[model samples]
Target: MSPFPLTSMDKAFITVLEMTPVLGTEIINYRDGMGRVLAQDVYAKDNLPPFPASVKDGYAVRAADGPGDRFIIGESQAGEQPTQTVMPGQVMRVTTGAPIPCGADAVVQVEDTVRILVQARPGQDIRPIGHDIKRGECVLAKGTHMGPSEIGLLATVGVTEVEVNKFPVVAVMSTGNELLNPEDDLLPGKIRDSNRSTLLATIQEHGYPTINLGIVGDNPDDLLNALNEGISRADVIITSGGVSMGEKDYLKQVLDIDLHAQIHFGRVFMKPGLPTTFATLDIDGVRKIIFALPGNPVSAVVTCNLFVVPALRKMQGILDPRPTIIKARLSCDVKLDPRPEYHRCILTWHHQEPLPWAQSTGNQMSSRLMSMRSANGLLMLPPKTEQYVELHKGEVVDVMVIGRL
Candidate 1:
């Protein structure tokens, strides 16, 4: 009964995830930089097109000139355009992205051209102003998070380099003597460990360099050896399991009080992840945040989405971090849990809207890891919730983040 004080839901825990100042900010070549979050907002150094650029391989003419069947005047290709004006009623041969001739305002698609008996009738005069991007446009604004698509957009605006928070070096580990490799012959009562793969993939996708220390079984010496290796080598260390209060839960008992870490209520009132724990403390001058999630696959993943990802985002200098949560209703009849619960769920678009259901693959047992294999997200419920719920098949419940992790 004397482990620690249990606190009510406090915003401090959430803020603590972001309280640590970010370390290292550097510029990565835009081509090599994807999945890295932007530490600073970006503004257009110059007009995106630099000048009125063509969207189609057709004529760039003044749209204000009205419609006119005109002759094709020379051409402008992708390379530097010779300073020349496309006078009214005259067409300039233009290809995709070639700057419009000086006076042209719109571009007509080459496909829209009609051939006359003697000449190509009316080359499409369709270069609408601001068709692609415009001058002084804030394409990459401040606080714009950089992903694959964002990186591509930055490249489109000719951004080769930009300031970004330095990525974190994370040491990721999974704990369980009962866990075994899938490739190895299954031992009696042992299951293949899946958490490490899932977590590693998740952290790496967001640009963290992950050091995988494999799995640690039910040995204090082995676990400590792994922990020592992780703490000494990694900037931030993360582990799954071992933080619960069961008799075998060595993870909780091993931490020293000098660590001076504040442990939020380790036993969340919620089901599936009651044992989830979040703590932060300084070791040798470096502040480290430790998240101990439930051993269950779904619980581990849910905690990671709501807790670990944000912490990782913070370590990488991302302030105001939050996960994408969606609302989805049960697809079929659902029985709520008597205890506040989190259920592994499959999410799909129903009637053009997101539908989340605890309709697991037969079993919903926390250790029944197969159910998690088929799950796309976690469906959260308040504690001591109702047991029976019959509602819309396509309603919005709640959704956590997705991906294997």
Candidate 2:
């Protein structure tokens, strides 16, 4: 019944994972490594504190001295060593983080030292060497995303230079015979191209570098030229339109014949983006990835999030590069399609419910770009069958969280 062999979303995802390759590593300064993925494990070169440290501003004395006023010997300030050792009944003034004086086994707080109300125990208020981090211990493992905390940890271990995966640069474009530039005046039988803007922004939002290839016509020669240009400059190429069954759709043919690219899958069993296609071409032993998404505005954005983003993450050496899926409750009844549908919805959370509520963004027509407005999640609804035609309100469904909460 279908024009092309339909691949399930899972199978298509697996195929993408199989073909996606992790990029080589690069050493960069840890100060500028935010949002980058670590390519190698980092270990601590020395122990944290590197010596027994005082935990409070107090008097350092031997525990056997018990409750008694002792003679103050020397003051041990933070980052300075004590010049004198504590004898039998002698005490040394110590500030927080100051190194414990030699032969001092206990630290008594100043308030308690007025009378020694609480008997000082051996090793009291003392942070021993390597208490926080031990030398030669692995502090950060490979594939770790470098956030503020991760960067701090790298500095804590004295690793000024870090090895991270090279981020893949993406090139985005739009193709159609009836397409016009966004700034161009409206003409009969022509619509402004918005897919390129949306796709480029989506890729940029995830912190990847992007190249705007602008718009290409439906002509095979023009499409082939644009593809070759993208292949030469970027690691990944994304084109919206020319993947469907329309007569003007020549992207697949050009890729197959002109570029000799291997088309992984031409169609998927999903709504809004059934004609989504992914392929790869190897030139001079370097592989380039291509994703030809559907023309519809919503479909183009959705497929980019579902397929393209994951591949980009994997290329950056992420440990798990899949979109996060969470459970949500439907706020209204919804009809089902024969193929799985990724319904756009505004997901909201409340204190009363365990799951967030997924409310539809009105009509989910593929061409209706407004359906994506303020939508933070995509509800994964199953295919319709004779036994079930519609899902009821309050029913739970899997939602792919695409936006910030």
Candidate 3:
């Protein structure tokens, strides 16, 4: 059979994004809402600081009274109503967040005065009603990723339960005849599988659920069985190896002839990962995404971040599912490849420079897993040409942030 046409990276990415579907929503307790995408917009039911409240431990007195000695009339504490009203020359003791008495217009902090402060201006140290949040206002918007602050805001607005998008469960498998379990001793021609472990950890690091399907050899029946199990359990399936020009490379055949899956793109125009394949299959009226990445360690990991991560993000209802790209200065010169390369690098920030420095991890071979050791970003380097074969130091280029700095 003829080889698949090589699709540009941008084109293949667009196809994968368009074919990926967002999953449905489910109701979960707000306490368990962290790291989940909000399915619905949450509105405030009541005004924050329902009444005029004190911002300090001081006396609630009439602003017109100015600086003068005033008799302490009553005390107002938080979460309780003020029983006594402030009249002329009379003050009410109020704690922080305590509601101001009916007649008081301002609060004078205790440190400012032994009995009463100097001139007290109206609204001084007083948090007016609805100052923090107004009633019926949108507190959290749809597609918001719940974090510490987001969850706190939900609880502050009395949202006990929240509607969140369901996270897609990913099934990761490594395919090759020479693969063995990580714990097993390596034979003469066999090597331990690192792709499955790396892919599973990568997916899990982003808070997504993952199923380990272990390793499958270069056999059509075993590949079919493993894929069937993955489709039965996971929403997205990721497999490494068997997409390139090898005689035993039957993954594409199994997907096409056996499962009748729509093979969107079988080749990507990029370095390290040229034979990255993407496909979609419908079973029992539900769609499942499949990403067949290259067998090399670096290619598998880089392509996973470039393609699979964005698809997973879209499935979770994230507003923008693409990886963040920022401009960075190259610390050293880099020889360009014929195809666009996602060169792994260590990104660092300096107070003196506007853009971060992207230092290559060195020896960016597809099989060299050490290149990814401290890599926090993938520098998007342009393809080599006659005029520009290498990018000089201090040259600005786009870098996709893959890990935290």
Candidate 4:
């Protein structure tokens, strides 16, 4: 009966996974499909390379004519067909990516042989037809997230446009009486709102459409109105501040009373963002999810990456809707906390080390926005069972790669 669900991070994630749903698919130009989850398997219309081609600047000759001089029949450049055939003791000059001429079974690289009269062995460098990819083969499977390399590969396979999952529309708002707009002049006891901009950029960088609901004061009526508008417009609603236990915090009460939202979890046993709240509302028979994040700058960012990003990914139909987690060695010693800590870090690779090293961004206070600057990873450290426990240098720990390392 209690609305307070003192949830563990993993259990809360499971609840979110259960509640979130994948969005519908839409046809978009493949060139603009970067970062979009593919809705259908993309097959190659023709073989990659489409013909036997040279992998290097070389001479194409029959493999049977091994280690011998040959007459240069014709030149084959990239995008052009060869006019002359390579009969025995004859070769065709071919640049990289050029088609292997008729009757040519091998390519002798220019570096390996003299050019004017080519001396080569057969089948040395000739790339066979369908060597890279077969015709009608599934190049990209469904649920794949299109990146730069994926886009290039799809273009190579003649996929001009593709079916991709439609990204969810995210509504973002910041709640506080003490907050002011970025353009506003500094006033006593007022802080400029950073959470809205930070969270909005994070959502947009992941390619979701964002609705800037702007700032709402601590008044219950204003807060309730904003929440109401968000539910009607957005697939997901994110608000920073007003979830923590404070005199001015009215979000929990408003959600529980007026809207009759099901508060899934009120507190998560995690540092920096312990009071993070997640809830759902059934408006017009369609459920909308809400992520009421912490007020501190760092806390807002971290929880968003951990919670909201995964939910958005799920909505976008990603098969593995989780942050990119990797393993790296700690560069310096770190003490354990009572609750699990998502310590912001900069991951770097040493010349001789097999795995990357993680250095903690000093002063991990949740209020410090600078802690996130230049940070590419989050060290997932477990809570300490013993009060004296500490992680030493060179210890391997799980790291979530949040940005480029």
lDDT by residue (102-165, candidate 2, tens digit) is 8898787766753456765788899999999999999999889989999999999999998999
Candidate 4 regions exceeding 4 Å error are 1-3, 55-75, 82-94, 100-124, 246-249, 284-286, 327-336, 353-357, 362-373, 386-396
lDDT (C-alpha) at residue 359 in model 2: 82
Off by over 4 Å in 3: 64-67, 87-89, 362-373
Q: Which residues of candidate 1, in runs, are more than 4 Å off?
A: 6-23, 52-75, 78-80, 83-138, 176-179, 187-194, 202-207, 217-220, 242-249, 257-262, 317-320, 332-338, 351-358, 361-373, 385-396
Off by over 4 Å in 2: 1-3, 184-189, 362-373
Query: Would you estimate the TM-scores of all the predictions?
Result: 0.74, 0.92, 0.93, 0.83
Please write out the lDDT profile of model 1 over residues 1-405, one tens digit for every residue.
325443333343455464554667788888766766676666565555566666577666665565646776687988987576777677677778787777766666544662321222233434345556775667776555677899888787777888887777888888888888768899899888877777777777666798988888766678677767876787766778645655434766544442345555466545555667666657766776666677776566666766677777777766566656677676554556555555666765546633444443332345443443566766655444255444346545666655543
Clashing residue pairs found in predicted model 3: none
Task: For residues 1-405, write the lDDT of model 4, one tens digit per residue.
Answer: 134767998998888878887888999998898888899999988876678878788777776777656678679999878777778787788888899888888777654773445554556666777888899999999999889999999888989889998989999999988999999997999999989999999888887899999999888899999998898889999999845655424888888888899888888888768888888888776678999998888889888988999899989898888779999998888778888888788888889989998887754443233444488888899899755598999999999987756
Worst window of 10 by summed lDDT in candidate 3:
364-373
Q: Clashes per prediction? A: 15, 0, 0, 1
Q: Which rank order by lDDT, best down to worst?
A: 3, 2, 4, 1
Candidate 3 accuracy as lDDT: 0.87
